[PDB]
């Protein structure tokens, strides 16, 4: 049956065939190639359309990626920040979704609850796109593996390690991606952490690996993990907006999974480093200086501002985080185009 | 005399002729029919023009209506939120008006003080649109009577009930529209509310009824007011951010004016229900639940979280509140276009 | 060597030649004249280009100028206010700069640290425009001297007085631009203010007066300095948010420098009055009313709420401050087009 | 919800809301007026799309309506005749369906099996439009009630008589349209036909009458039925052509239900005559004359060529069947455009 | 030389270089990606050209591929069915050919006689495209090897099995494409079929294997053949339909060459299934069931409807035959565009 994403919402990537997901990634690349030639100047297929982008919490990368992709396509965009994006408080989300559907041809939404995305999908009647929830980061997934495909070509049987807080939405998304791409994933970090990943998500990925040809293995040894890894992907240890008592705990249980030059050269030569950013990889930020000062005793790794990754790795030819960053815009453009349709 | 809105401001609707208002309601209908055909793609008369839309207070519905209308026409729009839209504090409003008028070709402004709108109109030198004040909600009026006209055709002598806190800007806005369209209004609710309605406005409406047909009447009985009504229009009982001590008082005065199925069933078979939204008609809002919980026993009417309208009505075929939400965009488009001119 | 501004950043006007600055002033007038003919309706050279404009402190005037300038040229803009515009808190400005460079073709930045503009110029690899720093207000300089030239023609050897807190960024930016236009500058205010101005800036400005003409004198007497002046330019006495001990101190030091009709009478008949706005010239602002109330006793100049300029002057035909504001837009458009290229 | 038919198939009209069906009717009218102005010359929203129109059995009127509609809109069209439109023998319907969806943006299908329309909707994944099956004629319904609304305006509580073989596809379809429009329908013909009408269609119809306000009724008497009827709709008795003995039995059962000037006169001054055509209202047709021959007696009615209607009636100012025909095209356009989207 | 197919006819693929055939494949892919972006809307290179597509025998898939391709490109198309596409009886092929070339810019032809394609190439003097003859299927070859290159990338030294009636047009065509792509082909079926394969085609193929690096081979065993095979390509056994006795002899000879899950499993994890369709992989087809009836025994395989492939196989993730189908169109476009020229 035809890859036809016209009218679909991008709520969870798991609601999509392996073929539909490979389409999106391919289209992302094609659309990036077209822009470098200036083909977007005379060919703006969404003129006469508008999308709203809602953020219950600020996301500079995701908002800019939508703003630019929509704009390059010919669409008008209206950005609603946190002040205006709050849901179910002074109006039910059912009703907010039904109105947005009367004004706009597509709705982007970034908030904590997947149920909120769900109501948005059910009641608006237009394509809804998940800009990031507690459960998932679908647009970033596409950007991530598009980045990998540009580097290595077909991804089947290539190996990727998500090290760090792998039970969180990025980590779980990365696993989802690898499943669709038939890659060997190694979720590397604390052992306890596996136990907190939705059991339905795992099942689907495990089928996906069967069908597409990867594997899902867990791991506690950073250097073991990196063996023949083509890709090493990590993420912050600390969520912004919580107490140091919870920092203490978190950096404690993760302090052995910092990505450093050992881990990199323990992998392949042409291994690439991914991170969705921001990353704390030195002391250039006040938040960094803060952590390295108040906990730079109790823990030597953070003593230099660095947490999930060493400035040495971050400044190395291995780091593709910035290409990955640019690709947020190209892949979101593929999502909007396929769903709204030319 | 020619219906020439070119250059005009929508400060207050009472500053326009019956012919002009009707031309606005009709243009609104035409503009929407044109959009359903895709005619806004090639035909974009405001390319080269920019409007500023100021909001001293967040209004999601009015802002999206303005952004989509102006985008569809080919206008650039710069949204200015509560932080940006202050007047009289850091700079005279007379001064701000003048500057705004150097940059933009039209100005929207939603704020508490109608005198802020008058200053903008006087010193900007461009068309100013009142997005909502304490006095009147002019763009809302065109949307509402357009919805009615779409449903019913010529409104002359048709009957409308505005029920509840009818003395607020929305109730008064509705009476003004009923006047302009020769309708019979019954303002339904507490009897001393009528003492609150500005006397100059009352008089201008009295003159309009004499001219266009219809009439003005106050009623304290919801089921008697409904007899033979084509339209029942309600609104919220609470002013968000007012003291909860003031809530309890109001809901005490209005406890007998909640729109239920008995009310709909007393009006014409073909009656339609309006509400400018958001409405509290269930318990899917936080505020709804804390009303249900604190006041639910004392006023069993809000036990389920419903206030001005029951969910039973809200979910019926009578509710045209979402077409009325939709029409905010079409009518505001007729306003921008007519006022700025092709 | 040519006026090849293409690819440049407007970081500080002092990194430009006299010839490049005239060119920007001249292009601004040309762009202003083409808009009035409506030439911007079919001639939109930046279609397919996008800019990000960051403000870490609301700056209505500068924002609107960029938004309308970019729009008229055909570029998309995405506005990032104070919450999103933070640098060095949770990410290094170097990392942030690198990503904006992936998404945008140009970046505007308004913030206190000039070192942040530097960072952005260095790391983004795309034209960055200083929206305003503690050090300088380059876009405002082009708008201002444009305005004078529109009025007097060739500016060489004409007389401008900057009166008041002449050691602030506006007074100092005014001095810079007067040197670029070879004008006779008189900085009129308390004697020790000159000791507070950066010494290198003075060096550079003096070398400019040497090449272009004009001169740089200091004055303590508003009537004497106003002699033969073609332009009198002033600014607020207060930094808003700043406490009182510093406020009462300022108004105390400045009380002999309120620009009044007498001063204007001492100037050429042709004199024009400039102010970047907002100005406190009457009691129509809540703030200037707290000043009349509390301090209007100790200081009768501010008893009517007027400080740096009297309402009589500000309502006079000498006041070109409003043309000046309009020109913020035309000049910013010149900066965007030279710098991005057609 | 929102009236958003984008992506939908027109498989049965019953799969749509009263709101969607009205929108389809109203948009049809708008598209007709737009064509009369020549707006289709420069405004062609479907350029870059392609539709396939398959006919298992020729259907001149429907095919032409699709061809002009799609061309007017800018779409390419592939016509596939009986020989090509063959489902199930050479290849499974499921299979064929899945290919068509790889090539085309929309598919029309005229065949006998409704189950064939369903497979095409399921398997192609593009909009499918029922061109006419044994069970329903949804493009024809929109045309008729469009034609009626053009003459009478709001249709609610107006009277339409379907007389003849009222249990066939056209009768049941007229009944369906009458419910969506809240009219009184009178199904007039042989008593036992109401027993061959799908009980579910009926229930669904009763529900719509409950909601829109018509009613259903069965008559056996042409004159009692015509009382106060705004519309009289008939159809052929003889679908050619099993023998000339089922004709015997059909004219046999139908002989008293011919539409003549008696019936029209018994209906309103204002009544109109509808007929999907071809009609048999005289001998100008050879098939007609072969009936006049083989059956002029027994049955004296069909002796002169006329069958379901008298040439006397077909020629009166009452007959709108050619307006009903032109409308086939306008309404298919609204269905193509809504369903594909501009 | 230069890859310049401008002016050329696609009469036999063997009349083309390995370089030209690759170009046709690669351009097909490029055209597909371009369509997914909507680049065909504003970029229509063949506006002002017209092509005739004649079919001596219906061929739904090929006709539709030509119709969408030409329309996408901006060309008019005249479809001429069996009755019209008659060569040699009413008028000499030479004559007809010479007229067509006076009217059309290109001509497609689907008939049995290759000699008919040759006369059209000689006499019309415009590009002619072989839509399928008894000897070859050149548009189909480009589609298949396009589909294979999309899945596997560079095709050189990959293994493809053609199993079934491998001496018919489709088999020999697959063999030809396999040589141009330097793959190992295994022709698997009844031992004596290799004796009905034109000796010149073979020689030409051997030469290409010498140059591109594949090889040719004959098998009689489905499982030995599938060893390390990337692609398994089959086709129908029964072209309907001489009697039901040649079927006897065909299923007779072909009964051991059915494609089942055994064979797939004996081939690679990664293998794909191709089939030009329609396939007979179940009973959903009436022609299929008439086989299950008349021949369920002798032959137990065709008892359940399946013939050349098992419904079990047709439904696996291995079957790419619908991607192979979509590709018919993309590749005919590359052939139309190369041959007519932009």
UniProtKB/Swiss-Prot annotation, chains A, B, C, D, E:
Keywords: Arginine metabolism, Cytoplasm, Transferase
Top EC group: transferase
Reactions it catalyzes: carbamoyl phosphate + L-ornithine = L-citrulline + phosphate + H(+)
Chief place where the protein resides: cytoplasm
GO molecular function, one term: ornithine carbamoyltransferase activity
Domain of life per record: Bacteria
Coiled coil: none
Keyword Transferase set for record: yes
GO BP annotations, alphabetical order: arginine biosynthetic process via ornithine; arginine catabolic process to ornithine; citrulline biosynthetic process
Binding site for L-ornithine: 169, 235, 239-240
Enzyme Commission numbers on file: 2.1.3.3
Pathway assigned to this chain's UniProt record: Amino-acid degradation; L-arginine degradation via ADI pathway; carbamoyl phosphate from L-arginine: step 2/2
Localization (cell): Cytoplasm
Keyword Zinc tagged: no
GO cellular component, one term: cytoplasm
One family name in Pfam for this protein: OTCace
Positions of carbamoyl phosphate binding: 59-62, 83, 110, 137-140, 276-277, 328
Family of the protein in this entry: Belongs to the aspartate/ornithine carbamoyltransferase superfamily. OTCase family.
Annotated function: nvolved in the catabolism of arginine. Catalyzes the phosphorolysis of citrulline, the reverse reaction of the biosynthetic one, yielding ornithine and carbamoyl phosphate which serve to generate ATP from ADP.
Quaternary structure, from the entry: Dodecamer (tetramer of trimers).
Name of the protein described by the UniProt record: Ornithine carbamoyltransferase, catabolic
Annotated organism of origin: Malacoplasma penetrans (strain HF-2)
